[PDB]
Each structure stands twice: as C-alpha cells, then as structure tokens.
C-alpha cells in the first residue's frame, strides 16, 4: 500500500492577497484540487490511505485523521470532514503582526511522525511506502532553515519521498529538501490547470514513478555562505565545534569562543 500525506500551504497572508487581487485562482479551488487528488489517490486501491495537513503562521492542524448524491461512502466522509475543518481554521485565527511567514517545517514534522505512527500499527505483512506531497504557496522564512533541514534528513533515513509542488515562487530551501530524498519537484506556472499536473506527475507512486516519463529534475544550487554576510562562498573555514561556514581566517570564530592556537 501507499500512505499519501498532502501538506497544503494555506497562508492567509498570501492566499488572502489573491482574494484582494480578485485573481482567477483562489484558495477554495486549491483545496478542491487537493481534495480531488486525495479522493483519486484512495480511488487507486482499498489498501491505500491518505491524510492532509494545513499550515498557518501560528500552527498546523490536520484536515483528516450516506450516498445522498449516490456517492462512495468513504470518500464522502473525506469530502465533508476536510471542508468543515478547513473553514473553521481559516474563519478563526488570531492576528500577530510580528509573525507572518508561513510555517512549513513544523507542519512536516507532524507528518513524519504521523507516518511513523501508522507504520508501527500497520501489520508487518504489508509494506507501506509513504509519501509527502508538499504544496508550497508562499515564500519561506530564513529562520526556519535549521529546523527544516533536520526533518528532511529524518525523511531520508526513514525512506519517505518529499514531492514538492511549489507554485508562484521557487523556494530554494524546499527544492533543496526534495532533492535529498529523491522526491520530484514540479513548479506549475498555470495555477488554474494545477490539477492536471497532480494526477499525472505527483499521483503516480514510487513503484511506477521510475517506469514513467516525468519532467526532468531542476538543477539545485547547493550554495554556501559565510555568517558574516550570507553571500555565496566557495571556500569555507569551519571549526571543529561550531561547524559553521565562515568568511575568512580569524583568530577565533565568534560563535565558538575557543582558544584557537596559531601555527
């Protein structure tokens, strides 16, 4: 089986800007497209199971743990539960001007353990190939680099694929994240036609991903920079304690305070 997890980046600051702009694309359609992808995913097989996670400047809350229109009962629960839950999160939200950048690292952190929780309970007879279909929608925060890097490494060891689907912006960190774990990276430029992408690029699972033609991976600029300036540097002078990339040779690195002995 395959346990999909969709990390939708619903940032009201960015998504609301679209509402003010009166653009064709809106968060409501984005949720519907993701809703369809989840429904289609579980459509693939009974053993398949999914989940959803929303992101907000404050926190992240799971959107997912008869046949009135003649519908499949199980997916109907998914349709109702997410629609009711997403509106509640968006409708009710405190205002904090200091913190406005979208939170994604913590949102992923909840996912990784969630898959681990499912991976333990599921019977050892069936193998579970988990995946994370991260859908970014806003620029990332610089202060989140350290935390976000750790979870990505955790995914690598735990064998989970981070399938990024950034749109409207290319977050160098996220594209760096997906490359480590081998996840695909698709930058959809036609937001209205987003859904055609997922059912073709993201939807196929790791089992069939190899035996299929998909867009080539984007080159990743594994830049390095000194803490002095944050500018690209090709030669770094790290110490044995900080393990911090520095600009030029110094008697003692500030972040260490070590008694470096010259020679």
């Amino acid at each position: 089986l395959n346990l999909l997890v969709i990390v939708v980046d619903a940032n009201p600051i960015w998504w609301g800007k679209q509402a003010l702009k009166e653009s064709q694309f809106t968060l409501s359609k984005c949720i519907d497209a993701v809703m369809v992808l989840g429904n289609s995913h579980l459509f693939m097989n009974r053993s398949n199971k999914l989940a959803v996670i929303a992101s907000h400047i404050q926190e992240s809350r799971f959107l997912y743990p008869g046949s009135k229109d003649g519908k499949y009962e199980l997916l109907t629960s998914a349709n109702e539960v997410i629609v009711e839950e997403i509106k509640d999160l968006m409708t009710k939200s405190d205002i904090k001007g200091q913190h406005t950048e979208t939170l994604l690292a913590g949102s992923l952190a909840k996912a990784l353990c969630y898959i681990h929780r499912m991976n333990k309970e599921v019977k050892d007879n069936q193998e579970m190939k988990s995946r994370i279909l991260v859908i970014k929608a806003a620029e990332d925060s610089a202060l989140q680099y350290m935390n976000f890097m750790n979870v990505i490494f955790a995914a690598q060891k735990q064998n989970i694929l981070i399938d990024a689907c950034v749109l409207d912006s290319d977050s160098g960190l996220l594209q760096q994240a997906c490359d480590i774990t081998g996840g695909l990276y698709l930058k959809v430029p036609q937001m209205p036609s987003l859904l055609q992408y997922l059912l073709w690029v993201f939807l196929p699972d790791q089992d069939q991903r190899s035996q299929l033609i998909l867009p080539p991976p984007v080159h990743v600029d594994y830049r390095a920079a000194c803490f002095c300036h944050r500018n690209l540097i090709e030669i770094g002078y790290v110490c044995s304690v900080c393990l911090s990339i520095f600009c030029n040779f110094s008697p003692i690195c500030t972040t260490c305070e070590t008694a470096f002995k010259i020679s």
Partner: peptide, 13 residues
C-alpha cells in the same frame, strides 16, 4: 458515459 459516471464516482453527484 464512463467519463461522466466515473467523475460522479470521484467527487461528483
């Protein structure tokens, strides 16, 4: 018919 029916079987009705 299958396209319509299947769509009704996938978030439709």
């Amino acid at each position: 018919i299958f396209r319509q029916n299947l769509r009704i079987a996938l978030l439709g009705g």
